[model samples]
Target chain A: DCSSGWSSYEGHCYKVFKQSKTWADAESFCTKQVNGGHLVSIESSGEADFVGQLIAQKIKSAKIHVWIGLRAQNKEKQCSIEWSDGSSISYENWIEEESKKCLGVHIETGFHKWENFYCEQQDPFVCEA
Target chain B: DCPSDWSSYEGHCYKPFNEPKNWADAENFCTQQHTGSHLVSFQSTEEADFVVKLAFQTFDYGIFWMGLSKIWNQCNWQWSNAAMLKYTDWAEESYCVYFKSTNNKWRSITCRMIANFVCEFQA
Candidate 1:
């Protein structure tokens, strides 16, 4: 079950915040918004598809980019990435040869295909619990 | 480049054959196509999306069998190529799985039923 503004899927609740914020701020926002909430950590293709569709329905844009919880500890090493929610990096959907400090889903390119960006860059983000 | 009548994506080649067959025959057919060929198994959403797009582009309005299946009267579902079942998109099941093109959702069906299928091999 989910709250008023959150949507439920596969035993988790997700909410999309349309306001743009930096990766750090977005993560902090989620931590405070809900007791156990954090930036959405996609663990499977099903969850990725669900998050992508959720963004399309809520944002209503042809080219929507939203922040997810993935971030690289060291920008030079892509394998150093980890989820903000402290979950294991079990699944990945990165676009070929694209890596930065922060990760986000670039919907215009394809559904739930991740692209890396600077952590300082601002974008709307999704939160999950 | 992929072989004739096949499509390439992310270091892999895929082909959707319109000919209908049971799940066992489909797996055997894919195996005979190439050394490492097998029915398509999706490891990521992008791959699944690409395969679904390919299925629709190849043909419209039919279910296409993928690689995921369970042993008859058993519980565990596994891919034909022996990859771990890490991701799934079950819309609703028997033993074998098929992708419904009209709705772009996966559903379980009897393995003995005849249906089209997609084959994949490393590029």
Candidate 2:
């Protein structure tokens, strides 16, 4: 249930795969792709009751629960569970006070711990395209 | 010659194209690729007489002439003659430099401008 490879934008998230690097290593690799833009997502809806979705006249609507971008660092404060679209914290889904403990951790090399894990530990990621 | 689909790290340069984005529109679009990382390059040597290049054990040390970097503050400075990686930047070449060439170059747009589209068209 992770939106791996995805990135945050104005208030949404988007994903695209290009260059190859590790996790922290992959930090800002999206800048030189031929796609024109880096990993990006759709706009945020800002409502929990309302589901965030992507729509097009010719394409069927796509609904997403969560996206990828920021991330958890160590077991303490996560890297930053940011929306691929760079949404406001008001738009995130924090579970209880663990606001710092959930998913978004850097699990492994090319893989990220989109889930909750100790940053220093190794795991996996799941970016989207 | 612009470095097509190339990205810049500290001062060095790197190139790899997996997705497709338009300038300004392509800004931040590099985060989704399956290649693993978004976009990246080597390190900037910061020497005036030396050359910038991309090296790999499996391949030869290729000299990229001028790597992508924080460029276009002035003129003829073309897209990816440096780096932006995201397929984007704040605005067109100047204004910042393209200021006279303002919005759409109205402020014109996409001059040295962000960077890229090279290598492929050459011999």
Candidate 1 chain A: 10-residue stretch with minimal lDDT: A77-86
lDDT of 1 by residue, A19-59 (tens): 99988899889888887888887778788888988887767
Worst 10 residues of 2 chain A by lDDT: A48-57
**Predicted candidate 2 versus true structure: per-residue lDDT over B5-120, tens digit per residue:** 44344443344332223332223444433222222211222221111222222123221211122222222211221332232212122210011101111111232344321111
Would you list the C-alpha lDDT of every candidate in the order shown?
0.69, 0.26
For residues B1-123, write the lDDT of model 1, one tens digit per residue. Answer: 688778899988999988999888998899888877888876777888898888887698788887755422232333222334455433112346577766455565566789998898886
Q: Going through the candidates in order, what is chain B's TM-score? A: 0.79, 0.23
- Badly placed stretches (over 4 Å) of model 1 are A62-64, A75-99, B1-123
TM-scores for every candidate against the unseen true structure: 0.42, 0.19
DockQ of each: 0.03, 0.01
Positional deviation of residue A63's Cα in model 2 after best superposition, in angstroms? 23
